[PDB]
Design a protein around this nucleic acid. Structure first.
Ligand SMILES: [Mg+2]
Ligand SMILES: [Mg+2]
Ligand SMILES: [Mg+2]
Ligand SMILES: [Mg+2]
Ligand SMILES: [Mg+2]
Ligand SMILES: [Mg+2]
Ligand SMILES: [Mg+2]
Ligand SMILES: [Mg+2]
Ligand SMILES: [Mg+2]
Ligand SMILES: [Mg+2]
Ligand SMILES: [Mg+2]
Ligand SMILES: [Mg+2]
Ligand SMILES: [Mg+2]
Ligand SMILES: [Mg+2]
Ligand SMILES: [Mg+2]
Ligand SMILES: [Mg+2]
Ligand SMILES: [Mg+2]
Ligand SMILES: [Mg+2]
Ligand SMILES: [Mg+2]
Ligand SMILES: [Mg+2]
Ligand SMILES: [Mg+2]
Ligand SMILES: [Mg+2]
Ligand SMILES: [Mg+2]
Ligand SMILES: [Mg+2]
Ligand SMILES: [Mg+2]
Ligand SMILES: [Mg+2]
Ligand SMILES: [Mg+2]
Ligand SMILES: [Mg+2]
Ligand SMILES: [Mg+2]
Ligand SMILES: [Mg+2]
Ligand SMILES: [Mg+2]
Ligand SMILES: [Mg+2]
Ligand SMILES: [Mg+2]
Ligand SMILES: [Mg+2]
Ligand SMILES: [Mg+2]
Ligand SMILES: [Mg+2]
Ligand SMILES: [Mg+2]
Ligand SMILES: [Mg+2]
Ligand SMILES: [Mg+2]
Ligand SMILES: [Mg+2]
Ligand SMILES: [Mg+2]
Ligand SMILES: [Mg+2]
Ligand SMILES: [Mg+2]
Ligand SMILES: [Mg+2]
Ligand SMILES: [Mg+2]
Lengths: 200, 128, 61, 87
RNA sequence: AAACUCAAAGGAAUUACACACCGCCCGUCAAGUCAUGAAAGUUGGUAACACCCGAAGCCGGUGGCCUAACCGUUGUGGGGGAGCCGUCGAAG
RNA sequence: CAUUGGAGAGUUUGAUCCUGGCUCAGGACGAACGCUGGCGGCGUGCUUAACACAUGCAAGUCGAACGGAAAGGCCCUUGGGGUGCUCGAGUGGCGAACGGGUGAGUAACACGUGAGUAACCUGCCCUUGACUUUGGGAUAACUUCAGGAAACUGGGGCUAAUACCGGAUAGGAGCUCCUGCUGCAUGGUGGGGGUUGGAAAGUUUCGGCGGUUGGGGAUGGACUCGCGGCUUAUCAGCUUGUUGGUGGGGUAGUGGCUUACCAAGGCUUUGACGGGUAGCCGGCCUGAGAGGGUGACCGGCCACAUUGGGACUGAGAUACGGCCCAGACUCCUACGGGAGGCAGCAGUGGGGAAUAUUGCACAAUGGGCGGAAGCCUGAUGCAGCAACGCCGCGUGCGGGAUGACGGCCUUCGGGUUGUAAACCGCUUUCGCCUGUGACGAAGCGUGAGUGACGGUAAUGGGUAAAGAAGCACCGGCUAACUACGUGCCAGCAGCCGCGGUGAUACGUAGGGUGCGAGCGUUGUCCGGAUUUAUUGGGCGUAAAGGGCUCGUAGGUGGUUGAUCGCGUCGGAAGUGUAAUCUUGGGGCUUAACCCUGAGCGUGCUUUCGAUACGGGUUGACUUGAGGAAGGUAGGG
């Protein structure tokens, strides 16, 4: 119920950097496997499916839960892709990643599932915990000196925190100013393509 | 006989009762003549909401309460208004009150010791 | 009814108890059912290593 | 029966059946006596029989052997017949 | 109508044929297979009908037999009950 | 004075366009099967044989109604005190008609919805007005006798009641007569008079608890009715208590419910009668919607309890764990005769592709009895079992080029598996080990005490990157390709098709893709299918205009005045339980799930308005239509 295999293979297949940089993605222009350099047809399904899989492997969400997110966004009022990206960003592991306390979303999932975090006073070990507005995520007092935590404390200045979060790095406290908007989620997929895909 | 009793609802190991009016012969979780209130005992200082006018009407028309409903009416004070007896009538204590916006504004500004205990944990990694 | 027996390999014979599922064989007039390999007397195809579940072949270490 | 309550109940049901049957048969006999007096056309005999039958119908209704509505219906029939006889 | 069977059948037009007239294509007969009809008959099933008989039971009679409460002119009577008959009546 | 909603693809030809079927991509399930399988949360789990059932349990309770004393318990030289609590068996009261099960029957006022009863009954409960009077005779238990293998049965004697039966006294019960106000016809109701009548029970630990009868309330039931929801005309006639009337009977009650008499009706091509299938619904699935399919859990109504029939008792009965009779079954028998009904819970056999434990507790909620403590509760709360469904989590995280070996491919250059590994540093959710340890109980109990679940959830500590990944697919639709083997063989396939020696379609391998504790297959339903087209199709040649006309029912209607207000439209009130569903808040660490507010409940009834249109009633007009007179053509 969690993808544990290599991520560079998925990034190469999907054609975009799922996470990180300056890595084995120097072989980017071609998917993994023996048949990587051949010319591709890329149907509309192919395109749509690529966008959906890009979002899925970026956020570490499997198909059933991603589908559930899709119906929630579709029911919600407003743009379906905007709401879907808003939900995926409101996931707690992504919140930790965006605040910059984790090197990657996989590391954020690791620490969240291991329970190194407090949500507004209550301990949460659910990576899919949907953080609500005005929430206060806190690092567990016992685990305020994790090696990944201190690496993040050394590196966060380079990292860019989105406008909808406030982070007290050394304190391990992520204040949620508001639930993010499409202009605030970084554009790296085609949510419109995903929405069109979930209609066929 | 017409009874004022509790109709069980909710999950396994999580009961919420509806103080309802139905005759004795009816099954426990069935059609009720009228729904009077609710009773959540699983919650802190159990929630006890009883419609005073309706419960007074049904007591005056002759509905027989079950012992549980008698306890709830004692706590709501209805069991004293009807069948006047010297009982404490301990109207439910509230199950306290949290808040979110005030805490967020308190911490947004908290700043100071936020990043301050934060550089103290910097000294901690030093200690780490 | 007449039932097809899929897969390379076959053991079932006269008075062999079988499980019969739906399924048409297009180039066979009058065959509208297939025999479920790996159930009752009929057994899984011997040398399967791909699509084993559809031929009732247990996984090999 | 399989329940001792039910065995007790069949015994008491038989007892109550005896009682009720006796009372109903007495009611029928009284009403028949009134009807035969009315057919004979007598006035005093029919009046006396009607009084007896109505009293016994009310007594049975009180005893619960018959419903009070049934007692009232039969009394009404008897009284109307007696009135027609008198007229 | 159905079983059964095919993955086409078809309309107009372009350059019933397009493997292109050494084309295509129809029906008997012979062989096999499958589904179906008829058929002397044969074997079941269901729903009732008309009669005969008719348990329980309620009701309607009758009760010479049996009856503690009621009434007595205190020899009993009233009323009830067993029994019996009749209608209806399951089953056969 | 805007919308929350609609995707196609393949296949007829040499090629094309159209028509058109077939097939597929989606969703779903009370599913089954194959391979595989870690955990948790919440649900669900005989759809077939309404098949036959071993065993335990599922309905009892009351000594404050009664005689009592067979047990325990106190007091006494072992019996004895019924003496007090207590208490088998027995009478008596109440309950047993609820709860629980199943869906066989039923095409029907069974159900949904809305009304009517001036045709109704209603124990316990509440309320209010009267009362609770005077007598009597039995009987179970017990005792004795007889009979029976048993089940048990019949005598003799004996005994108590809130058991049973006389009487008195009581309206709004019968009959009848005045009179007030009135409805919807039968009528309803207020007041007075005459006449004939109808009850009861006592008990206590003195704190209680009960009895009878009027009138209201509440509750539950009953009947009647308008409207609504299957198929079949290769079923056209059906009915004789049938349709109506009058008198009687009956019933809680109206009624051919029943009966006697009289009449000849009643239903039906707008489908009676017959056949087929089926419990109905709130809902569920699907769908843009309209619809289509469906009636598991949960909730409402109905029906049924071995098959058929019947009543009895009761306030109330299809009387599941009642009775009677018959049939079919099973069992006991001493052969004379007896006993029984899991579609209650668990369970067995059987059938089947297929569906669980002969569990714990009355702690909570609900129910029965008791004045109460309390007793009973296979209701229920729980646990066990199964990936059956939904949801959540894990099987690691960061770094790591020297792009290592090894597989596989190759153009022998290399490429690929692949940051994958090795290696380095981390983290400890779940699992395993160990500690702490609940809520549910503002209950209950005079108190003492009191949680089945349960050492459970939750949580601290410890272990090791470890105990934890499979399944399908890769020709097109359709995301993903090569090598080897095979050689129209073996085989594949949902359709098109593939295999005849270079197979991206068979088999294996490497690589890849989609999903993931699941993944596929099969079955079934809806979608795509506008492929029954009301929304939303067509009929010259593609399937489709009757051979033609007349004409019945039916459908439909030129201009206009007046009026009705049935359709139609707009308010109001009532109803549409709950759950579900949509949505706003809240709780479970999140989610599923749960609670709560609102909406929805697309209707129906009542009532008040509007009158443009449809229709009804009614009156005009002549242009449609027909007629008269004259003219007139023709193988009618
Ligand atoms: Mg007699
Ligand atoms: Mg009468
Ligand atoms: Mg034939
Ligand atoms: Mg006869
Ligand atoms: Mg008789
Ligand atoms: Mg006599
Ligand atoms: Mg007879
Ligand atoms: Mg017969
Ligand atoms: Mg053609
Ligand atoms: Mg072709
Ligand atoms: Mg006893
Ligand atoms: Mg029931
Ligand atoms: Mg049902
Ligand atoms: Mg009495
Ligand atoms: Mg109808
Ligand atoms: Mg009549
Ligand atoms: Mg049926
Ligand atoms: Mg239906
Ligand atoms: Mg049900
Ligand atoms: Mg009765
Ligand atoms: Mg019973
Ligand atoms: Mg019952
Ligand atoms: Mg039974
Ligand atoms: Mg069972
Ligand atoms: Mg079997
Ligand atoms: Mg209780
Ligand atoms: Mg108590
Ligand atoms: Mg018991
Ligand atoms: Mg492709
Ligand atoms: Mg080859
Ligand atoms: Mg359609
Ligand atoms: Mg279809
Ligand atoms: Mg068409
Ligand atoms: Mg036309
Ligand atoms: Mg044609
Ligand atoms: Mg013509
Ligand atoms: Mg013709
Ligand atoms: Mg006409
Ligand atoms: Mg008109
Ligand atoms: Mg007009
Ligand atoms: Mg709700
Ligand atoms: Mg929440
Ligand atoms: Mg509702
Ligand atoms: Mg008109
Ligand atoms: Mg002329």
């Amino acid at each position: 119920a969690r993808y544990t295999g290599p991520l560079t293979k998925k990034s190469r297949r999907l054609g975009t950097d799922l996470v990180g940089n300056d890595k084995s993605f120097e072989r980017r222009p071609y998917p993994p496997g023996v048949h990587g350099r051949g010319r591709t047809k890329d149907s509309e399904y192919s395109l749509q499916l690529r966008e959906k899989q890009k979002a899925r492997y970026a956020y570490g969400v499997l198909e059933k839960q991603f589908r559930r997110y899709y119906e929630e966004a579709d029911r919600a009022q407003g743009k379906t892709g905007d709401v879907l990206l808003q939900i995926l960003e409101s996931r707690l592991d992504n919140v930790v990643y965006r605040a910059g306390l984790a090197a990657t979303r996989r590391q954020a999932r690791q620490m969240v599932s291991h329970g190194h975090f407090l949500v507004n006073g209550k301990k949460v070990n659910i990576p899919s915990y949907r953080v609500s507005t005005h929430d206060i995520i806190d690092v567990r007092e016992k685990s305020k000196d994790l090696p990944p935590i201190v690496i993040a404390r050394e590196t966060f200045e380079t990292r860019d925190v989105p406008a909808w979060l406030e982070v007290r790095p050394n304190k391990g406290r992520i204040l949620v100013h508001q639930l993010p908007t499409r202009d605030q989620i970084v554009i790296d997929v085609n949510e419109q393509a995903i929405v069109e895909l979930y209609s066929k | 006989a017409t009874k004022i009793r509790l109709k069980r609802l909710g999950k396994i190991r999580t009961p919420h009762y509806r103080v309802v009016v139905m005759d004795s012969r009816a099954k426990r979780d069935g059609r009720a003549i009228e729904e009077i209130g609710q009773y959540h005992p699983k919650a802190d200082p159990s929630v006890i909401v009883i419609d005073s006018e309706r419960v007074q009407y049904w007591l005056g028309v002759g509905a027989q309460p079950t012992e549980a409903v008698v306890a709830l009416l004692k706590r709501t004070g209805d069991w004293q208004k009807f069948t006047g007896d010297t009982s404490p009538s301990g109207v439910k204590p509230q199950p306290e009150r949290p808040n979110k916006d005030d805490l967020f504004n308190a911490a947004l500004a908290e700043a100071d010791e936020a990043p301050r205990e934060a550089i103290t944990k910097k000294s901690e990694g030093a200690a780490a | 009814v007449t039932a097809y027996i899929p897969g390379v390999g076959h053991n079932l014979q006269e008075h062999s108890m079988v499980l019969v599922r739906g399924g048409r064989v297009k180039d066979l007039p009058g065959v509208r059912y297939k025999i479920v390999r790996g159930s009752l007397d009929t057994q899984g195809v011997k040398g399967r290593k791909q699509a084993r579940s559809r031929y009732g072949a247990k996984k090999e270490k | 029966p399989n329940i001792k309550s039910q065995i007790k109940r069949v015994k008491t049901n038989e007892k109550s059946r005896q009682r009720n049957k006796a009372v109903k048969s007495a009611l029928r006999t009284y009403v028949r006596n009134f009807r035969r007096a009315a057919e004979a056309g007598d006035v005093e005999a029919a009046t006396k029989a009607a009084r007896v039958a109505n009293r016994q119908l009310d007594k049975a209704a009180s005893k619960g052997v018959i419903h009070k509505n049934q007692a009232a219906n039969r009394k009404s029939a008897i009284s109307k017949k007696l009135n027609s006889l008198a007229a």
